[PDB]
Amino acid sequence: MQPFDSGHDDLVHDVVYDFYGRHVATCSSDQHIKVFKLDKDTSNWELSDSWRAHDSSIVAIDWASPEYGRIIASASYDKTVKLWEEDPDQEECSGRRWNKLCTLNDSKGSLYSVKFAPAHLGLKLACLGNDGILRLYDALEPSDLRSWTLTSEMKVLSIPPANHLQSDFCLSWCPSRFSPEKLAVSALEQAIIYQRGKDGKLHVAAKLPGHKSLIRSISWAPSIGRWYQLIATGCKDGRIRIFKITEKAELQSNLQVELLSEHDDHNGEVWSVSWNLTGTILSSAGDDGKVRLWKATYSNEFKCMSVITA
Amino acid sequence: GLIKKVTHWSYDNLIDYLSVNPTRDEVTHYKVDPENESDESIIKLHTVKDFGSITCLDYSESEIGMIGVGEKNGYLRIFNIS
Amino acid sequence: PIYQHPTRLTYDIKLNPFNDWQFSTYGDDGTLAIWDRRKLSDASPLLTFEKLVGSGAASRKYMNSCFRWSCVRNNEFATLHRGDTIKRWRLGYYCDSNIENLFVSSVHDTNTMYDRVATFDYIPRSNNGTSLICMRQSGTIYRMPISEVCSKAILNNRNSLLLSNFENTEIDEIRVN
Amino acid sequence: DKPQAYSNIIPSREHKPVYLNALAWLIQYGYVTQLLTFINIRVDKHIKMAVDEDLEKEFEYDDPEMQHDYTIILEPERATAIEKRWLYRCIYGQPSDIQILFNKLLKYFNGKVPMELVIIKEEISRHDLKKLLNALDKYLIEIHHW
C-alpha cells in the first residue's frame, strides 16, 4: 500500500482510471481536476495537469473511450457538466493542457454521477442529479465536439429530494455490444435497469429489488462472454447485493433479475463497489475501515477473500 | 458539561481546552496533544473551584489565561489560569 | 440594530470558523438551523433539521452542546445523537448565478468508544485528521479517533487497486508487480 | 444558642475546675445531658456513575445540578459488592491517614454508635475525627442526639 499525495486542498471525491489504466483523474471539493500519469521508467504516479473546473465541489468525473480522443467529463454541485479535451501541444502542470469543450446547463439540480456510454453506442453521456432526471447527451456533430445534444430525458424520481435529506445517485452502463443498450440507474433507494426500445426512447426494463436504504454505488460487471450479466450494489445498509441478470412491449428482449448473493460483512455502509477487467474480483469499501475483495469459488456464489484495512 | 476548544494560547502544537463538570462547579484547564491518541495526552493543568452554577463560559484570544465564567446567580467571574 | 429577524431558533450561536457569514442556532424543539447573515440582512434559514439536537432549550438552562462546526475543513458539522453515535454531516453548495445555497451531501456515522456522552469537541491533527475529545455524563473526559474510511476502491486492467479516503488527501495504491 | 462545646462558657483556665464541678453538678441532678455525634454514610449519583465506569472497565442533552439521585447505605458492614465499591469510591483522592481512619471506622458508620465511644474505643483523637468530618461533608450524614 504505497501512498502518493494527490495535492488537493480538500476531500478527493471521485478517482477514475482510463481505458489503458496508466492515467488517473482525481476530482475534489477544492474545485480542481488533477490528471496523473504512470511513467514506465520511474514507476511512480506523477502529476500531468491540474486546473480549476467548476464553481462547486466536483463529485463525479469519467473518461471517454480512447477511440474518440482524450475527453474527460465532470459533474459538480453547481448543476453543470463540463467536457475537457486535451491538446498535446501544451506544457504539463500548467493548467492549459485540457481545453474546455461544452457546458451542459440543462440540469436544474446538483449532479451526482456522470458515466460515458460504451464506444459502440457512440459518444453518448449520462447525467443524474438531485432532481430525479436522467439526461443523455450525444455528440452528433462530427466536425466539432462542442455541440452535445440532449437525446433522452427520463424521470427516475417523481419529486426532487428535500434540501436537508441526504441523497445518492449512481450510474452504470452495460459494456456489451451484443445486447441492447442498457443503463443501470440508481435512485435514492430504487435501482432501475433501462433499455432503448424500438421507438428510440428509453424504457424501464427491470427493477432490482431489496435496497432498504440509500444506494451508494452501482457497478455492472464487464461482459466477458458469459450468458449472465452481474450487477454489484453497495447500500447504506451493510449489504453487498449481487444481481444475476439473464437476457433472452416495445423492448428488444425481456430480462429477468435474480439476487445471486447478499453479504453483511462490512457492518456499516458499503460506500463503493467496483469490478475487475474480467468481473472476477469485487472490491467493496465500508465504514469498518476495511476494503474487501470478493471472488466466486466452486460455484456462482461469491465468497470473501483478502481484507485490506486502512 | 461544557467543552470549549481554545486557540491562540499555546505557541507549541498543543491545543488548550476548557471544561466544566456536569454539576457546574469547577473550571478545568486542559492541554491535549493532537498527535498522540492515548488517553494520557489529555493533560490536566489547573482546576478553579468555588463556582455556584455555571451557565456560560468564554475566553480571550489576545491575552493568555483570561477566562470569563458566568453564573445563574448573577455574578460574572473574570479570572486567569495560565 | 442592523437587522432583527423573528425566529424561534435562537439558541447557541456558533460561527463557522471557515466562513464568518454562516452561523448556526437551534430551538426549544431541537430544530437546528444553519443561517447566513447576508440572507437575513437582505429571510429563510439556509438549512433546517427537524428534531436533530436535544430539546428543552427554554425550560432548561444547563444544556450540553451536542453540535459542533468542523475546524478541520469547510462545509461540515458534527452532531451527537443519543450519546452513542456522532454524525459528520458534509454539506454541498451552489451559487444561483455570492450566497451559497447549502444541501446535505453525505452523512458519516461514527460509534463512540464509550456510551453516555453528553458533549464533545474537535481535536485537529496533521494531514486533515480528526479526533474528538468527549465528556461523558459522569464527567469523565476521554479521547476518541475518527477512523479512515475508504471512499472508493477502483480496480484496473492490470489488477491494480486504488484507495481513496474520506478524511485526508493522499491516495493508496496496491500494485500487482 | 446552637449547642457548642462546654469550654465556651468557662471564661478562664482558673475557672475551669469549678466550672467542671458545676457541669458535674448539673449532670448528677439530671439537668444536663450530652449531645453525641452519630454518622451514617450517603452516596450520590457521581459515585454511582464512577462505580459504573469502573465496572465497565473490567437526560443526556441537559445537566441539571439540582436533581441528585442520592442513596443512604444503612449498614456498610453487610454491604454488597456494588455498595462496598460505593464506599471505597467515597474515599478516592484522600491521603493515606484518611484512608486508614476511614477503614478503621467504616463498620461504625451506621447512625447508632456515638463518635465519643468510637474515639474512646479506637484510640483516635478529636482532630483526626474533625479532619474526617471536614474532608467528607456531602457523603457523611450527621445525626445529633443524646
Question: What technique was this entry resolved by?
Answer: cryo-EM
Amino acid identity of C10? T
CB-based touch D/C (3+ pairs, under 8 A) = yes
Q: Among A59, A48, A54, which Cα is nearest to A95's?
A: A48
| Alpha-carbon distances of D45 from A94, D60, D67, D93, D115, rounded to whole Å | 65, 14, 9, 17, 27
Q: Which residue of B has its CA nearest to C146?
A: B37
Question: Could you give the strand order of the β-sheet that contains A290-296, starting from the edge strand earlier in sequence?
Answer: A272-274, A282-285, A290-296, A302-309
C162 Cβ under 8 Å from any chain A Cβ = yes
C127 Cβ under 8 Å from any chain A Cβ = no
Q: Which residue of B has its CA nearest to D44?
A: B23
Residue B2 has which C-alpha cell? 461544557
Q: Which of B1, B37, B72 sits opposite C143 (nearest CB)?
A: B37
Does the distance separating the beta carbons of B24 and D63 come in below 8 Å?
A: yes
* Partners of C143 in beta bridges: C133
Does the distance separating the beta carbons of B53 and C139 come in below 8 Å?
A: no
Residue labelled with grid coordinates 441537559: D62
**Which one of D47, D65, D69 would you mutate to disrupt binding with B, by most B Cβ within 10 Å of its Cβ?**
D65
Residues of A numbered 281-300 whose beta carbons fall under 8 angstroms of chain C's beta carbons: which are they? 281, 283-287, 289, 291
Three-state SS across C136-154? Answer: ECCCCEEEEECCCCEEEEE
The minimum CA-CA distance between C57 and chain A, rounded to whole Å, is 22
Helices (H), chain D: 16-28, 45-57, 81-90, 96-104, 115-122, 126-135
Amino acid identity of C170? E
Report the half-sphere exposure of C59 (CA within 13 A, side-chain side): 10
Q: DSSP code of C67?
A: E
* Partners of C32 in beta bridges: C49
D96-104 and D126-135 helices, crossing angle to 10°: 100
- Cβ contacts of residue D57 below 8 Å, gap of 6+? none
- Cβ contacts of residue A104 below 8 Å, gap of 6+? A80, A81, A82, A83, A127, A135, A137, A148, A150
Does the distance separating the beta carbons of B19 and C118 come in below 8 Å?
A: no
SS3 content of chain B, % helix, strand, coil (to 5): 5, 50, 50
Contact C93, C102 (CB under 8 A): yes
Residue A221 has which C-alpha cell? 460487471
Query: Cα C27 vs. chain centroid, distance in angstroms?
Result: 18
Residue labelled with grid coordinates 442513596: D71
Contact C107, C90 (CB under 8 A): yes
Contact C110, C130 (CB under 8 A): no
Amino acid identity of D46? H
Residue A73 has which C-alpha cell? 467529463
C40 membership: H or E segment, kind and range: helix C37-41
Q: Using CA atoms, how far apart are residues A77 and A55, in angstroms rounded to an integer?
A: 8
Cβ count near A157 (within 10 Å): 17
The minimum CA-CA distance between C118 and chain D, rounded to whole Å, is 5
Q: Are strands A290-296 and A282-285 parallel, antiparallel or unpaired?
A: antiparallel
Report the half-sphere exposure of A198 (CA within 13 A, side-chain side): 6
Q: Using CA atoms, how far apart are residues D101 and C35, in angstroms rounded to an integer?
A: 60
> What count of residues does chain A have?
310
* Partners of A52 in beta bridges: A32
Question: What is the radius of gyration, based on Cα positions, of chain C?
Answer: 19
* Partners of A309 in beta bridges: A290
The minimum CA-CA distance between C2 and chain A, rounded to whole Å, is 28
Does the distance separating the beta carbons of D62 and C63 come in below 8 Å?
A: yes
Q: Using CA atoms, how far apart are residues C65 and B32, in angstroms rounded to an integer?
A: 20
Contact A118, A177 (CB under 8 A): yes
Q: Which long-range contacts (CB under 8 A, 24 or more apart) does A94-97 make?
A: A94/A49, A95/A49, A95/A50, A95/A51, A95/A52, A96/A51, A97/A35, A97/A48, A97/A49, A97/A51
Does the distance separating the beta carbons of D50 and C116 come in below 8 Å?
A: no
Question: Could you give the strand order of the β-sheet that contains A228-235, starting from the edge strand earlier in sequence?
Answer: A215-220, A228-235, A240-247, A255-263
C150 Cβ under 8 Å from any chain A Cβ = yes
D45 Cβ under 8 Å from any chain B Cβ = no
Q: Whole-angstrom distance between the N-terminal and C-terminal Cα of chain C?
A: 68
Q: Using CA atoms, how far apart are residues D126 and A288, in angstroms rounded to an integer?
A: 61
Q: Among D39, D44, D84, D95, which Cα is nearest to D67's?
A: D44
Contact list in D for residue B49 (CB cut-off 8 A) is none
Q: Using CA atoms, how far apart are residues D12 and A46, in angstroms rounded to an integer?
A: 96
Resolution in Å equals 3.0
SS3 content of chain C, % helix, strand, coil (to 5): 5, 45, 50
Question: Could you give the strand order of the β-sheet that contains B66-71, starting from the edge strand earlier in sequence?
Answer: B54-59, B66-71, B77-80
Query: Cα C3 vs. chain centroid, distance in angstroms?
Result: 27
Q: Which residue of D has its CA nearest to C52?
A: D61
Does the distance separating the beta carbons of A20 and C103 come in below 8 Å?
A: no
Residue A112 backbone zone (phi > 0: left; psi -120 to 50: alpha; other: beta) = alpha
**Chains in contact with C via at least 3 Cβ–Cβ pairs below 8 Å:** A, B, D
Q: Using CA atoms, how far apart are residues B28 and B1, in angstroms rounded to an integer?
A: 11
Does the distance separating the beta carbons of B19 and C141 come in below 8 Å?
A: yes
Q: Using CA atoms, how far apart are residues A293 and A303, in angstroms rounded to an integer?
A: 9
Query: Cα A150 vs. chain centroid, distance in angstroms?
Result: 19
B26 Cβ under 8 Å from any chain D Cβ = no
**Which one of B3, B20, B23, B47 would you mutate to disrupt binding with D, by most D Cβ within 10 Å of its Cβ?**
B23
D63 Cβ under 8 Å from any chain B Cβ = yes
Residue C48 has which C-alpha cell? 433546517
DSSP chain A: -EEE----SS-EEEEEE-SSSSEEEEEETTSEEEEEEE-TTT-SEEEEEEEE--SS-EEEEEEPPTTS-SEEEEEETTS-EEEEEEPSSS-TTSS-SEEEEEEE---SS-EEEEEEPPGGG-S-EEEEETTS-EEEEE---SS-TT--EEEEE--SSSSPPPSSS----EEEE---TTS--EEEEE-SS-EEEEEE-TTSSEEEEEEE----S-EEEEEEPP--S-SEEEEEEEESSS-EEEEEEEE----SS-EEEEEEEEE--SSS---EEE--SSS--EEEE-TTSEEEEEEE-SSSSEEEEEEEE-
Report the half-sphere exposure of A60 (CA within 13 A, side-chain side): 26
Please state the φ and ψ torsions of residue D23, each to the nearest 5 degrees.
-65, -40
Q: Using CA atoms, how far apart are residues A62 and A42, in angstroms rounded to an integer?
A: 26
Does the distance separating the beta carbons of A6 and C48 come in below 8 Å?
A: no
